Design a binder for this molecule. Structure first.
Ligand SMILES: *[C@@H]1O[C@H](CO[C@@H]2O[C@@H](C)[C@@H](O)[C@@H](O)[C@@H]2O)[C@@H](O[C@@H]2O[C@H](CO)[C@@H](O[C@@H]3O[C@H](CO[C@H]4O[C@H](CO)[C@@H](O)[C@H](O)[C@@H]4O[C@@H]4O[C@H](CO)[C@@H](O)[C@H](O)[C@H]4NC(C)=O)[C@@H](O)[C@H](O[C@H]4O[C@H](CO)[C@@H](O)[C@H](O)[C@@H]4O[C@@H]4O[C@H](CO)[C@@H](O)[C@H](O)[C@H]4NC(C)=O)[C@@H]3O)[C@H](O)[C@H]2NC(C)=O)[C@H](O)[C@H]1NC(C)=O
Ligand SMILES: *[C@@H]1O[C@H](CO[C@@H]2O[C@@H](C)[C@@H](O)[C@@H](O)[C@@H]2O)[C@@H](O[C@@H]2O[C@H](CO)[C@@H](O[C@@H]3O[C@H](CO[C@H]4O[C@H](CO)[C@@H](O)[C@H](O)[C@@H]4O[C@@H]4O[C@H](CO)[C@@H](O)[C@H](O)[C@H]4NC(C)=O)[C@@H](O)[C@H](O[C@H]4O[C@H](CO)[C@@H](O)[C@H](O)[C@@H]4O[C@@H]4O[C@H](CO)[C@@H](O)[C@H](O)[C@H]4NC(C)=O)[C@@H]3O)[C@H](O)[C@H]2NC(C)=O)[C@H](O)[C@H]1NC(C)=O
Ligand SMILES: [Zn+2]
Lengths: 211, 208
């Protein structure tokens, strides 16, 4: 067993913090836990105050002679968005000092996304499929969710870039929805929907159809 | 002990014969006691000798960073040769080897579409000019903006994104004062990619 345990601490998904009916979680994963001595303790802290409601799962033996152990802390939506810091401490007797990782929403003043839908380029109408573009810019923090739909139903064939840092410190991204050109030319309405903390009710939709 | 990371040349540098593409073998966490690192480089398993080791870069965390740089032939890289860097150091029981090469597969020509600012953005002081570059392979690409022969400073480009068909797309956003858009200035999105004729294409964007 040459080596030592490593800790990864994962944030909630952006959609989960923004919808009260969803369940946002912070997840602490410890890997390379000693095969011979796999007992691990977790301590969790929120703004440095210890909390006791995390759910720690049974350790899972890996194929490389190590264990992996996960502890899941359900967070309050408003705690996350109000910038509370979540600390996971992991102790193990084959480890000379506990390992601590901390995570929180990115620091800074939230900024409201501007959302702009862009039709296919005229050069594109040559093709059997066209691209409908959603530009979302000016937003902060980078935690965001983007989706497309038409007639109330989610569209399958879209891809969204990661947030990119802009020159003013805000973020932008684009979402591209691919549709059969026929669907565009018939005047079907498509909608880009954006979920972000700095939108009213955390959500806005911009629509797009043939002019 | 030390850790090795091997980096590919810049997309622009492999596509233009006058530019100098380099593969860079970076060694971190070399101790203060043994900054001595040896480098061997191979191209499809055959030793090459043109690598240059840059002077050791001392770091805040009590280690060195040592970099070896290998100039490559544009066509070797585009033809998919494997570049192997082997690193030997006293703090390493055995040498560490890393290999890098261009992504494998039939290259595919980027389609380049310029999109004007959304009508809703026209209430702003600055507007967004969009260049959609899609259907390309491999993901290595360079994108720049120009107007009246001259580079535009104020743009950001997304990384390549894997599309549903296994090609890549990205978007480039150039921001300009609304006045310049409204005045009929012509802006151009420049794309360099191996699958393009002469490795380069441009598309213009204007109010018109
Ligand atoms: C022995 O085996 C284990 C288990 O592996 C499994 O079994 C073996 C036998 C094989 O069969 C494996 O194929 C098999 O999977 C090995 O365990 C792995 O250990 C490595 C580290 O050595 C871990 O790598 C880290 O991975 C995370 C991302 O992890 C997510 O995504 C994985 C798929 O991409 C997925 O497999 C993971 O489970 C995990 O999934 C996420 O799970 C959360 C919680 O459940 C969930 O909510 C998410 O939705 C889900 N995500 C996805 C995509 O599914 C990665 O983040 C780590 O990167 C950080 O650390 C690096 C340094 O270690 C660094 O280089 C990176 O840049 C990055 O750094 C962080 O970056 C952020 C932002 O930039 C920054 O804020 C942070 O500060 C910074 N972190 C710091 C402080 O360093 C990292 O790459 C694997 O997750 C882990 N696998 C599993 C399954 O647990 C083990 O290595 C083997 N041991 C030996 C000796 O060989
Ligand atoms: C002591 O200090 C030094 C110096 O650190 C610097 O200063 C300190 C004070 C801090 O501020 C640091 O944050 C800061 O970096 C430390 O050295 C660092 O060591 C880490 C690992 O511990 C390295 O991490 C790797 O980074 C590469 C990316 O590296 C580029 O980007 C960085 C900025 O994002 C940049 O700082 C780097 O210099 C480098 O920049 C590039 O340089 C080349 C060459 O010149 C140039 O051509 C490029 O243009 C330039 N790019 C730029 C500017 O962006 C990252 O890719 C590595 O990830 C791989 O490996 C991880 C394992 O550690 C793994 O988790 C990842 O998933 C990923 O895995 C690989 O992925 C590839 C494809 O994705 C895949 O094929 C492989 O399977 C897989 N390989 C595996 C598993 O190994 C990795 O994160 C830092 O680069 C390095 N910093 C510098 C400047 O060298 C040192 O660690 C400190 N030690 C301590 C704490 O004691
Ligand atoms: Zn064992």
């Amino acid at each position: 067993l040459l080596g030592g345990p490593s800790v990864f601490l994962f944030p909630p998904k952006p959609k989960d913090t923004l919808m009260i009916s969803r369940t946002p979680e912070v997840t602490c994963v410890v890997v390379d836990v000693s095969h011979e001595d796999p007992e691990v303790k977790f301590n969790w802290y929120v703004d440095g105050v210890e909390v006791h409601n995390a759910k720690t799962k049974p350790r899972e033996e890996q194929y490389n002679s190590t264990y992996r152990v996960v502890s899941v802390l359900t967070v309050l939506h408003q705690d996350w968005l109000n910038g509370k810091e979540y600390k996971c401490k992991v102790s193990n007797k084959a480890l000379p000092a506990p390992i601590e990782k901390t995570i929180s929403k990115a620091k800074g003043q939230p900024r409201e996304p501007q959302v702009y839908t862009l039709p296919p380029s005229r050069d594109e109408l040559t093709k059997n499929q066209v691209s409908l573009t959603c530009l979302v810019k000016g937003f902060y923090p980078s935690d965001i969710a983007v989706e497309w739909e038409s007639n109330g139903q989610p569209e399958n064939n879209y891809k969204t870039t990661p947030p990119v840092l802009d020159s003013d410190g805000s973020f932008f991204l684009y979402s591209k929805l691919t549709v059969d050109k026929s669907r565009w030319q018939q005047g079907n309405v498509f909608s880009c929907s954006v979920m972000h903390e700095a939108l009213h009710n955390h959500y806005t939709q911009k629509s797009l159809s043939l002019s």
